[PDB]
Design a protein around this ligand. Structure first.
Ligand SMILES: Cc1ncc(COP(=O)(O)O)c(C=O)c1O
Lengths: 399, 399
């Protein structure tokens, strides 16, 4: 037909559908609280704004090298050494239009029909969509809430086959907020060292959003033996409240970086020049924003964890990173919502919650693990408190 | 293998190669004049820069709708009506990270194995690279310099087969600077009306760079019968000297725009927010920059054409738009260059010109039609004059 056969491999997005239903409820006058934000509710710090404005003033308005301006590729190589104790040259780095484009082109540069990509559940839904669009086969490995949504080494090992090309490792996790300690990650790298053909795609986007005394670690830092088959991907979107600017980056083996540069050159050429100069300042400038926001987010996390565990039938683990919680609604399965609807799935729970209380969350089965739902607490404490009060009232009314 | 088989369908780029030898020669201390620019030498106009700075100041730093902020999509729909007398709603528009991403995802959203894409030669080198990467088959149809590189209806009709899905229409053209009059375009749309399965991808990027009394016309304006199978693509890169900002756009039928949006959502999630607000001002603001640059560029064109036609063995047509000339070196084929090397191909002419005179151009066979070479006159008149003198000296020394 006219559209590519490949598009049929991509399942419709439950997350966009939730945003759409919420938007429809607000349009007809309902008081809706959205709990699906994927971006901080803070503006970009002034120092980053000023650097962008400076680049505009100087006339940095021309095409950049496809893989990034040299100032930013250098800043990225230094960040990987300074923050993650990894050794990359600037030539091993690539700047994309979002971390999204890094992941997309890593897959488009590598996937052939029959290639498998191991994706732990719950997963960010864009991961299997990209793999499927690029023609690969997602292979999902479920985690369990009793293990705080973290992968068991034995489950990772069973999922790997000679057809496995990639293992996607996202810590801290969207949607669960789970974050692997050094020792938890070492158990997984020990498995990967037993399957040397499997490349590792590590999504470190939420590196700087971690709570308490948790210490972030990335796969090649934990296992240097993974250096020649890992793409270490990160970005400024979450850490620096720069989601709109679209700057992500990665570092890895030269032959992969060259292949992604070739595809990126056909797709977008380099990322917006002004946004790249902004990202240079984000990485090289003062880092006070990071510490300030850890405290703000930890308080929001604590509020939501406290309130959700008071709700009838709800159980909420305490996450260690990112700004998501992944509570279970297992205690409400089989009960009758206020509307009369029998709650048979987490999708029923979430759609009844939205209609009855105007609180918009995403059901866990959309991310590969239920009966659960995701809440993003990247919004005000007043809105979180009001939304959790409504969730408490809704759950108490289920019979 | 680890890298995707699709990558092997893309031939290595001669445009990057020549840019490599020029950079290398410059490193050895040669005074190189580069005539392979693809971007205005002027900076982004101040009104656009100010709009960008305003957007930064007030915090337009969040994720946008994937297809673009509503202000820009509305500005695009209004531009297509005001400037091209086309009727599109804002829902029919899509904003991408460069015109490249518009073109790339038009193909990625549609191409299946065996789908053919008719590309007139000389062609922008990225067109067949995109088609091949996405699995399509480029089908080249040569034009003649005697027609100033404008396709004849009979030639278009002979290249269309039942497998043709796309016809790529780039006017004014990179590399040739040819621009089809309304009359000349009607000859091709008359053919396209007889082949209803062929969609039209019209790349109007150089719309606002035309000379003399020429009046730009776009296919759907010429033939409204093509409305339901054309993607009308354009951008701010060339007209507003915004190459580094990466904003391109298109309008077309909703079923294609929605497919392109789905793919763009997986790739970038939407263009840099600050750059979208700059492009709002580009389209809606004063257009004095366009008119000013027509005069400046026309004078550069006249200078380059006249000097090239004084170079021995060179024949330079007068382009109607863009900022390229596509002179023939047919008169030098078989002569011996100053080095003593016999010029067999235009690739030989171009590499000898670079090595002997330090002038960097791109050989015509890279664009599918020779013996020719492309010169960009988006550079100062002093540099064009000096480069053309060197070319004259080189050509005179060919025996
Ligand atoms: C886990 C994860 N990876 C990658 C991304 C991409 O972030 P961006 O493309 O905005 O830089 C996100 C954003 O939603 C994310 O949550």
């Amino acid at each position: 037909a006219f559209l590519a056969d490949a598009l049929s491999r991509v399942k419709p997005s439950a997350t966009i559908a939730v945003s759409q239903k919420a938007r429809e409820l607000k349009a007809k006058g309902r008081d809706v609280i959205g709990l699906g934000a994927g971006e901080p509710d803070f503006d970009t710090p002034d120092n980053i704004k000023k650097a962008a404005i400076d680049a505009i003033d100087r006339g940095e308005t021309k095409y950049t090298p496809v893989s990034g301006i040299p100032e930013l590729r250098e800043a990225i190589a230094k960040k990987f050494k300074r923050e993650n104790n990894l050794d990359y040259t600037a030539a091993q780095t690539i700047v994309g239009t979002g971390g999204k484009q890094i992941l997309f082109n890593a897959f488009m540069a590598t996937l052939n029909p029959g290639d498998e990509v191991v994706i732990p559940a719950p997963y960010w839904v864009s991961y299997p969509e990209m793999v499927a669009l690029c023609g690969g086969t997602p292979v999902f490995v479920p985690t369990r809430q009793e293990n705080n949504f973290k992968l068991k080494a034995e489950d990772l090992d069973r999922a790997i086959t000679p057809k496995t090309k990639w293992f996607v490792f996202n810590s801290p996790s969207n949607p669960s907020g789970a974050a692997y300690s050094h020792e938890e990650l070492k158990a997984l790298t020990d498995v990967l060292m037993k399957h040397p053909h499997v490349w590792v795609l590590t999504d470190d986007m939420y590196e700087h959003l971690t709570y308490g005394d948790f210490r972030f670690a990335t796969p090649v830092e934990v296992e240097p033996g993974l250096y020649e088959r890992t793409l270490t991907m990160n970005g400024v979107s979450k850490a620096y409240a720069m989601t709109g600017w679209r700057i992500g980056y990665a570092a890895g083996p030269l032959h992969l970086i060259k292949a992604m540069d070739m595809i990126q050159g056909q797709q977008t050429s380099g990322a917006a020049s002004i946004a790249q100069w902004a990202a240079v300042e984000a990485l090289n400038g003062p880092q006070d924003f990071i510490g300030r926001n850890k405290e703000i987010f930890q308080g929001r996390r604590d509020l939501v964890v406290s309130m959700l565990n008071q709700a009838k039938g709800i159980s909420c683990p305490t996450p260690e990173g990112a700004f998501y919680v992944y509570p279970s609604c297992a205690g409400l399965i089989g009960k009758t919502a206020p509307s009369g609807k029998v709650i048979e799935t987490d999708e029923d729970f979430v759609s009844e919650l939205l209609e009855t209380e105007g609180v918009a969350v995403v059901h866990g089965s959309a991310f590969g693990l239920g009966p659960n739902f995701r809440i993003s607490y990247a919004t005000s404490e007043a809105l979180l408190e009001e939304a959790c009060r409504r969730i408490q009232r809704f759950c108490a009314a289920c019979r």
